[PDB]
Amino acid sequence: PLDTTWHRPGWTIGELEAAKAGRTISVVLPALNEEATIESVIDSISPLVDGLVDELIVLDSGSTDDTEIRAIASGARVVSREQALPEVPVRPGKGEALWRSLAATSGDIVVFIDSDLINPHPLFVPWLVGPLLTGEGIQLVKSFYRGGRVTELVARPLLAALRPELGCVLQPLSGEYAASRELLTSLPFAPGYGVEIGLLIDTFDRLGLDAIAQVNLGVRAHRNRPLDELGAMSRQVIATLLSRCGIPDSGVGLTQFLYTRHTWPVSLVDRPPMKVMR
């Protein structure tokens, strides 16, 4: 029921660049403390600039390490959250950075690539924009690949429970996807780690499956985090997913006993469609 390129796409960079037909392509890498990996990621994409890709920015989500200077040294334009929308104070979390990035870019197509990937293939951006440029009716392109414990224990079982029409999607929370600016500026942006599951469910409720494609990116690798930082990610994924399914969420943060106690933040506050800022 869901368009799925299962094996390596066949289009070439010149074919895809032809099919642009006046549309522009923006690439955004959100970065919070990724000095180790940001340079390899930028370098996998920058060859495409002025060709297929018209714009590449690194949205610096508050990095205190060498992310900014290493990204500058790789030729990337670096935008802080403040610089993307200065009149609006900054909130924490990933969803904030991706929402803000819509103001700092202008491509008709926006591509999101996580800045914590290790040895990312240089055909990621070409593989993601493929269905947008060639397919008709595609507005969102998620990716799948190949670890994935929030996805496989939280997101996918919960979608099976509440939005079973999205059971065919293989990586709902994937950080690598592309979508049209029209779609992105229409949708609200969940906070924190809810942003991906939120844009998936919202796109489906607004356009159905036939506007959603997914593409195989081979196999991936990234930081594999501690189980506790996943508890908080899981919580925010649940919070967002319940909201889009009309289920009230208590707003209570996950408390963990390490034994010593600590409560993690969870946000129920979405950012509005970027359209309202026109």
Ligand X SMILES: O=c1ccn([C@@H]2O[C@H](COP(=O)(O)OP(=O)(O)O)[C@@H](O)[C@H]2O)c(=O)[nH]1
* Segment holding 162, helix H or strand E: helix 156-162
CA angle 10, 19, 21 (to 5 degrees): 170
Annotated ligand binding at 211? The verdict is no
Is 5 or 174 the residue whose CB approaches ligand X more closely?
Answer: 174
Restricting to residues 124-143, which ones interact with ligand XDX according to CB under 6 A?
Answer: none
Q: Diameter of the chain by CA atoms?
A: 60
What's the residue count for the chain? 278
Hey, what are 11's tokens?
């289009």
Residue 255 to residue 243: CA distance in whole angstroms: 21
Is 171 a residue that touches ligand XDX (CB under 6 A)?
Answer: yes
Residue nearest to ligand XDX as judged by C-beta position: 150
From the list ligand XDX, a copy of itself, ligand X, none, partner contacted by residue 253 (C-beta under 5 to 8 A by kind): a copy of itself
Binding residue per annotation — 222? yes
Q: Interface with ligand X includes 32 (CB under 6 A)?
A: yes
- Beta partners for 78? 58
Which residue's structure tokens are 């923006």? 26
Rounded to a whole number of angstroms, the minimum distance from the CB of residue 227 to ligand X is 13
> How many Å is the Cα radius of gyration of the chain?
18
The answer to whether 96 and 88 have CB atoms below 8 angstroms apart is no
Nearer to ligand XDX, 224 or 250 (CB): 224
Q: What are the φ and ψ backbone dihedral angles of 270, each rounded to 5 degrees?
A: -85, 155
Identify the residue whose tokens are 């293989």.
170
> Total residues contacting ligand XDX (rule CB under 6 A)?
14
- Region for residue 251 given its phi and psi (left: phi exceeds 0; alpha: psi -120 to 50; beta: otherwise): left
The residue within the footprint of ligand X, chosen from 39, 54, 68, 116 (CB under 6 A), is: 116
79 binds ligand X (CB under 6 A): no
Residue position matching structure tokens 């989500």: 61
Q: Is 149 in the site for a copy of itself (CB under 8 A)?
A: yes
Cβ 94 to a copy of itself shortest distance, Å: 17
- Angstrom distance (rounded) from CA 160 to CA 163: 6
Which residues pair with residue 196 across a beta bridge? none
Partner touching 269 among ligand X, a copy of itself, Mn ion, none, CB below 5 to 8 Å by kind: none
Q: Are 189 and 270 in contact (CB under 8 A)?
A: yes
Q: Do 40 and 119 form a contact (C-beta atoms < 8 A)?
A: yes
Q: Which of 16, 25, 27, 31 binds ligand X (CB under 6 A)?
A: 31
**Contact string (CB under 6 A) for ligand XDX, positions 30-69, x = contact:** ----------------------------------------
User: What are the binding residues for (2R)-3-phosphoglycerate?
Assistant: 148-151, 224
- Binding site residues for UDP-alpha-D-glucose, as ranges? 30-34, 61, 94, 114-115, 193-196, 220-225
The residues binding a copy of itself (CB under 8 A) are 6, 147, 149-150, 152-154, 156-158, 160-162, 164, 167-168, 170, 227-228, 230-231, 234-235, 238-239, 242, 247, 249-250, 252-257, 259, 266
